[PDB]
Amino acid sequence: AGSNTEFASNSSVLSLVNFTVDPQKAYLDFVNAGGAPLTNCVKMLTPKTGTGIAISVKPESTADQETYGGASVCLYCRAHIEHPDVSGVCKYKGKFVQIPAQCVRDPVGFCLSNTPCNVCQYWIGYGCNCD
Amino acid sequence: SQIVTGLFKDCSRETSGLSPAYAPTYVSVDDKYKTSDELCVNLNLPANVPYSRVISRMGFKLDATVPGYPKLFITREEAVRQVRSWIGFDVEGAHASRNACGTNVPLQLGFSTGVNFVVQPVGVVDTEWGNMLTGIAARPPPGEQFKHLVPLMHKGAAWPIVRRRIVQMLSDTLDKLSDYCTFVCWAHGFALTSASYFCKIGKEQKCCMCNRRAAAYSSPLQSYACWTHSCGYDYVYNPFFVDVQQWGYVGNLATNHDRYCSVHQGAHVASNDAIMTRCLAIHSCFIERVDWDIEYPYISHEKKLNSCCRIVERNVVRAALLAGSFDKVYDIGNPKGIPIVDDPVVDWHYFDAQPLTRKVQQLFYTEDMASRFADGLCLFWNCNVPKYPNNAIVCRFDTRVHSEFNLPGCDGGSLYVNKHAFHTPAYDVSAFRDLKPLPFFYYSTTPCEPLKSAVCITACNLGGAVCRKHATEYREYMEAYNLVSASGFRLWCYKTFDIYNLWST
RNA sequence: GGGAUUUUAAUAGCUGGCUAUUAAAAUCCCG
Ligand SMILES: [Mg+2]
Ligand SMILES: [Zn+2]
Ligand SMILES: [Zn+2]
Ligand SMILES: [Zn+2]
Ligand SMILES: [Zn+2]
Ligand SMILES: [Zn+2]
Numbered sequence A: 001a002g003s004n005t006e007f008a009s010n011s012s013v014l015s016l017v018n019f020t021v022d023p024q025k026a027y028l029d030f031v032n033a034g035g036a037p038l039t040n041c042v043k044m045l046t047p048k049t050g051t052g053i054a055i056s057v058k059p060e061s062t063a064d065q066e067t068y069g070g071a072s073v074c075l076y077c078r079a080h081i082e083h084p085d086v087s088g089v090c091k092y093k094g095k096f097v098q099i100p101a102q103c104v105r106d107p108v109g110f111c112l113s114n115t116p117c118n119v120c121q122y123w124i125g126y127g128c129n130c131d
Numbered sequence B: 001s002q003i004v005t006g007l008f009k010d011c012s013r014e015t016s017g018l019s020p021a022y023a024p025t026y027v028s029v030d031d032k033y034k035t036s037d038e039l040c041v042n043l044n045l046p047a048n049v050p051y052s053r054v055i056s057r058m059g060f061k062l063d064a065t066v067p068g069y070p071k072l073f074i075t076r077e078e079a080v081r082q083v084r085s086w087i088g089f090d091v092e093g094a095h096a097s098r099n100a101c102g103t104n105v106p107l108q109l110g111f112s113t114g115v116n117f118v119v120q121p122v123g124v125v126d127t128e129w130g131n132m133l134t135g136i137a138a139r140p141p142p143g144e145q146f147k148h149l150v151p152l153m154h155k156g157a158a159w160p161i162v163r164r165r166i167v168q169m170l171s172d173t174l175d176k177l178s179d180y181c182t183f184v185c186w187a188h189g190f191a192l193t194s195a196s197y198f199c200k201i202g203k204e205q206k207c208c209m210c211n212r213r214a215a216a217y218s219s220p221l222q223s224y225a226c227w228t229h230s231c232g233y234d235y236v237y238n239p240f241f242v243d244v245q246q247w248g249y250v251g252n253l254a255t256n257h258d259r260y261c262s263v264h265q266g267a268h269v270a271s272n273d274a275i276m277t278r279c280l281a282i283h284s285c286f287i288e289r290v291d292w293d294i295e296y297p298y299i300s301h302e303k304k305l306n307s308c309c310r311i312v313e314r315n316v317v318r319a320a321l322l323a324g325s326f327d328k329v330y331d332i333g334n335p336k337g338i339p340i341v342d343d344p345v346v347d348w349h350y351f352d353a354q355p356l357t358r359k360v361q362q363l364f365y366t367e368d369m370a371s372r373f374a375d376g377l378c379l380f381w382n383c384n385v386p387k388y389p390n391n392a393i394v395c396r397f398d399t400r401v402h403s404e405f406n407l408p409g410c411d412g413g414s415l416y417v418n419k420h421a422f423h424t425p426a427y428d429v430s431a432f433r434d435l436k437p438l439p440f441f442y443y444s445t446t447p448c449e450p451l452k453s454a455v456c457i458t459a460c461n462l463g464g465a466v467c468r469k470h471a472t473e474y475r476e477y478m479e480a481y482n483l484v485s486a487s488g489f490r491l492w493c494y495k496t497f498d499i500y501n502l503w504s505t
Numbered sequence C: 001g002g003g004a005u006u007u008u009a010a011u012a013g014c015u016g017g018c019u020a021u022u023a024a025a026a027u028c029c030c031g
Helices: A011-019 A023-032 A075-079 A107-113 B076-081 B144-149 B159-174 B188-195 B253-260 B270-286 B302-325 B468-487 B499-504
Strands: A065-069 A096-100 B052-055 B086-096 B104-111 B116-118 B122-127 B130-135 B182-185 B216-218 B223-225 B235-237 B240-243 B328-332 B347-352 B377-381 B392-397 B406-408 B414-417 B421-424 B489-493
Touching: A011 A023, A011 A075, A023 A075, A023 A107, A075 A107, A075 B130, A096 A107, B076 B270, B086 B144, B086 B159, B086 B188, B086 B270, B104 B159, B104 B188, B104 B270, B116 B159, B159 B216, B159 B235, B182 B188, B182 B270, B188 B240, B216 B235, B253 B270, B270 B406, B270 B421, B302 B377, B302 B392, B302 B468, B302 B489, B302 B499, B468 B489
Parallel strands: B086 B182, B182 B240, B328 B347, B328 B377, B377 B392
Antiparallel strands: A065 A096, B052 B122, B086 B104, B104 B116, B122 B130, B216 B223, B392 B489, B406 B414, B414 B421
16 A cells, blocks of 8 residues: 655655754754765756746756755655744745755755845855845 | 665555655656656646645654764663663554555554553645644554454544653653663554654753753753653653564564563553563563673662661571571572671571582572471571571562562562662562561660660660660661661561570570 | 565566566564
8 A cells, every 4th residue: 555755765864854853953963974865856857047046936947056846855845744934834845946066965955054045036155146 | 775665655545646846755756757867857737736645654763873862772781771761662553544545553552651542543644835743534453353442543632632641651650760761662663653753852961950861852842851840841852762572582472471471461452562561671681681790870778778688687687596596507598608697606508599609509499408408597688489498587578569679570570679680579478388477676785885665685675774875776776677678678587486585695 | 554574477777697666475573
């Protein structure tokens, strides 16, 4: 019964995230200590001629970015735990996330460690110019 | 990499996968979106939102090693080090039905303290906007073995209340024993899946009101506290887990427990399973392999009890040796052969199961040595024999008295933790059928430098008088004897004992 | 209903052999 979803290699860390008081610090400590990052993310095939905004309803990657499914790069969606956002809604799910090409080793860690700009809707430090 | 696990399984009945922007994993994407290079394409076909898919929680593995984070799935030796925190843990479950199929939810949680909690069937449901931990349709396990679980489907409570009840019960049990909690499970998979509902883990924390280790977590206060200050807390923080099946046991729990125990016979209930699990763990660690070199730190008054035991013994053995003119003594059970009292001039002989000194011989008592040891008094101090002979002084711990240093054990026995872990067999009153209870009395031969007693054996009381010296001595002996008796030790003597023989000295 | 081991079949891939996925069967444990 049912259909399998996740590899056995990731089950070591997500379980940890399912039990910790604060999951973001747990995942960042696991990755920074030398653990393997999350794999099995939904990476999309794009023409790479997008506007390069962080979160979009359609793939909008530039030549220096990669487009991922929104639910695949959210730690709370991968581990199936409660979101910390207002009203429990996910800001990634149902959308597409543009991750810089030099940070594709760990998209989940990039989404946890970074936030988009409130004005230009780009990643802060990776395209945002509001100075 | 390639091996797929049953954790986070999609237990929905839908025949198709999810959209690339909604699927959590590449495996869960529907195959219409995938391409040859392990990439998904964004087709123009509209998504099937909204949805609600039940996600399985079976398959947790807490084997990740992170610096600063403790190891919660502990091995055998450190579980023996943490024996005061042993709480048995069993969970009976209900299968998901109707909207879902392919996962189990907890239905009745049982603990070794004899407490059962019935919960509503609650699982994880993934929706287009996120996920929720709410109630799902469930069914009892089919079969005549689980007919008792059918009423429990209509008796559960909400999980947040049961969380606080569990934390309160654990705090009431483990307040004086330890700063930790060790869940002793038989099959740790479903037990860990159910423990995900009421346990939080992380770095080791200090209690917010004292210096003790924090064992409970409060989500509304976001605070950590020990067992004393965990009023209103809803989560168990950093519990230890022990799997008894991984210790080399073949078969089910019932046939393994019933092989060495006969006390915990009971109807099929999760608390009974947990009690049998903890009893089997106790048998595995303190009866199968004893004398493990582990010392346990003191808690309340064990040093004073150790002093008072010798204070009582040096009085009772001396009086027994003086009465009856017994000139030969066999101290069966003496590890080193050190005599109790050396003031009377009598012959001394020493025996033990594992003698530490060449002065002590090897001996085991099976009532066939009753005529063998018939020419002298027999000391049995903390010596466990199924039947004691007619000419003997006996001190035996009563396992029915439960204390901080006396944990429940196996087959009616008790784990006495006094700088060492000893498994004492169950106190049987028929073992002293040739013996009598030793009456209270004091003997003294010291010189002299309100009280009235008809049992004080002293030349002062023999003449019908008393002084401050013996009025204080008798009272400190009363304090020591009280402490020994209220601890749980019972003293027995040969049948013909009376203090009237002691006036000759 | 969940998991572990073994065996078989199909699919997919790689280099006579090997792995993975799915399905079926047997044994054992949990429910
Ligand atoms: Mg059970
Ligand atoms: Zn999310
Ligand atoms: Zn900006
Ligand atoms: Zn405290
Ligand atoms: Zn038992
Ligand atoms: Zn006197």
